[PDB]
Design a protein around this ligand. Structure first.
Ligand SMILES: [Cl-]
Ligand SMILES: [Cl-]
Lengths: 247, 247, 247, 247
């Protein structure tokens, strides 16, 4: 139908070889977008090409490297036209209580989870503004809003993503580009699957929904914000956390 | 498709004869819901039946009257089965600076815009909890979060809707019922159409989007939250305001 | 010293016979304010006069009765001059899960915890605006921001206090009147003392501070906002909850 | 008196040669703290020693240099004992619309306004935790919460400060260390004094207070949070913005 239809849009989803990033890339494709998903290695890139088939392709992308960013985008633009939707999902954790937290654990989190957004957003914004149409959607975290012990770095970067989102939203609203954040809670992934029973039960104790989120549930919120129907939403943080936190 | 498909769901949308409430009712019907929209009068009810056709019907409902509430719901339940989706959109304004604000202008706002949500939510929750499935979505306002001079009553009620929403979200999350608020900014409606040029330009000065939202844009955010895909969103306030405010 | 000095200010503190309200009244008096504290009965009023001594007095006040409000304020104004600082602390609970919550338990909460703030604020604002100086400080609750199961009425009223506060803050900021909310978490009081061990330990599990707050800690936050030094704080909600919730 | 008395506390205030940082250092001293204020150069350090006199001293501190941080703290600890209060006020701006924003303008803001907090907090936390007593207070900005066009970097760092604050607050609450942010709005400083009439009037148009803040008003909020009386406040953002934004 004409409802949340992304035919004619070109979407770039970073960190799309598995879990949330994969779900996003698949759902945007299913809604009609041409999707370029990225991974850190070529084998991941290939896995992305494999699941996307005729709806898009996989590329190798180092989100902390300007040269990689410039090369990946040139290839997209050459083949598909300018990016209409950017989903910043690439991200890592380097957990530790502050007194154990290395300089590199802090800086790597800042570079990968916050500075990347600045670089990638900057690389796509010009075309979006000239076309008077765009979506930038950042995959944040409940931890950005809630805070969490042992994750001061991750929390700082993810909260930073929101300050960036709000400022960019103001900057580009009049030109028809929205900028928003989706903030997952505890979503079932490989990382959460590796947790032991105690750890999972403990975390479930803080989720009124009494279960973990599915990656497809984050994907749905992303495709919603990516849609023409979400044009009047900007500078927003959409929380998908089973009631873990309520703002 | 299977995406945001509301076939099999029964939706009750209050205050549905025009604008936002109408847009909501029409979109939920288009996504497959059986929709009962309400109005204060039988002529409004009929206009509702007229636009819904085979997808639902209009009923006369006084949201400040328990007897009306009981009668409308009995009729729905008899014909359609229990309500799966409640959208509380009925609401009014009684604007005045505090020193001019009558006792009745305060109390009418509280009754219509806040106590109604208590009554209607209570009237539908039992079946939702037994079925282990439900959506309650309140149409709030940016004013509830931002505040606005000359609207301390409206702001209080709309902010009250959020405290109610969070508490109910916690109460019923484990039973698969979500409770959320959609908070419109400045949406083009009859009320906003009656504003003079100065007033509209002044208000647009505070919207980075530089336009009024469309009622359909509010409808889309409600339909999204009403969908199966939104099962992991609860206790949330979804702002649809063109950047007027950013939380 | 000249620091947070309230000499020359007249403060009205509702619900001041014990706990938080008493602590507030005693601290404002200690910082130099002439303090009128209220209670529902004459015996409470007397207990208030007894602890205030030469720094103020107790009066009987029914916050849900306009006639009582008019009479108490006339007395204050006659003796002391216009009220410079209003602290709305009077409030009650009527807890129940929604399906057990009586019409009267909802309406009594709305009247006592929200409509009271409308009435009392309205009754003091005119003199504050003419003098181009004033403080209105509402004692809210973490529950207004967080939500809580079994307290949807209380949450709604306390969240309503914030919408009212923001709107009034906008209405009167240019005239040198601030309007703010102090939002206590779990504070040691008679109510919390009556809780059993299980209930207290369960609630302490959600407080990172690992203790209940003291009424004096709420008093200090109110005295701070009441001070000249706080002239540039308005429309704000000051959370004093030991980390129970973080916004 | 015994009210907000900081006798026996050792306070480190970064960026204290002028404006807000100076006001903070002076007020903490006035409330009885031994204060070490810092500046980037020795001449600033000397100016700080000059205004502090017998209440403390100035030191040269490069907040983006671990070696400088280690040397300044050793000297404090040697002379005064462990730091009890840390105020992170050192900060810069590197404004530009995103498309004009250099890599270095982004990174310098991240390093100076966010990574510094991680380094300085880490350098002081151990002693605070062993003593079971501490205050870390970060001077943020309304722009962290509101966003602002042309300041996406500043907004991101200042929002990042909050995510860090909330996480650290959780980490150390049980050990009697609070962590909080004070978020100034438009405060009169050299930077705001250099603005032209149009720019100032434009910005005042967004402040309901209808004036700029004074540095002493930020200082008051800082000394309040630094006090024993604020022990039950942690993970909070205290907004001092004349109503410019209302959360
Ligand atoms: Cl309404
Ligand atoms: Cl209360």
């Amino acid at each position: 139908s004409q409802f949340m239809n992304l035919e004619g849009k070109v979407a770039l989803v970073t960190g799309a070889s598995r879990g949330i990033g994969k779900a996003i890339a698949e759902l945007l494709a299913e809604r009609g977008a041409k999707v370029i998903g990225t991974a850190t290695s070529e084998s991941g890139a290939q896995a992305i090409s494999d699941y996307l088939g005729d709806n898009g392709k996989g590329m190798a992308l180092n989100v902390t490297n300007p040269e990689s960013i410039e090369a990946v985008l040139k290839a997209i633009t050459d083949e598909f036209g300018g990016v209409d939707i950017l989903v910043n999902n690439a991200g890592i954790t380097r957990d530790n209580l502050l007194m154990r937290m290395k300089e590199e654990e802090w800086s790597d989190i800042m570079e990968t989870n916050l500075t990347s957004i600045f670089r990638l957003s900057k690389a796509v914004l010009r075309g979006m503004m000239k076309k008077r149409q765009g979506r930038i959607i950042n995959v944040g975290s409940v931890v950005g809003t809630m805070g969490n012990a042992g994750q001061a770095n991750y929390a700082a970067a993810k909260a930073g993503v929101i300050g960036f989102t709000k400022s960019m939203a103001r900057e580009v609203a009049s030109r028809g580009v929205t900028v928003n954040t989706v903030a997952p809670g505890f979503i079932e992934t490989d990382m959460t699957k590796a947790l032991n029973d105690e750890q999972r039960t403990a975390t479930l104790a803080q989720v009124p929904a009494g279960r973990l989120g599915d990656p497809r549930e984050i994907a749905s919120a992303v495709a919603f914000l990516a849609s023409p129907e979400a044009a009047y939403i900007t500078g927003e943080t959409l929380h998908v956390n089973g009631g873990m936190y309520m703002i």
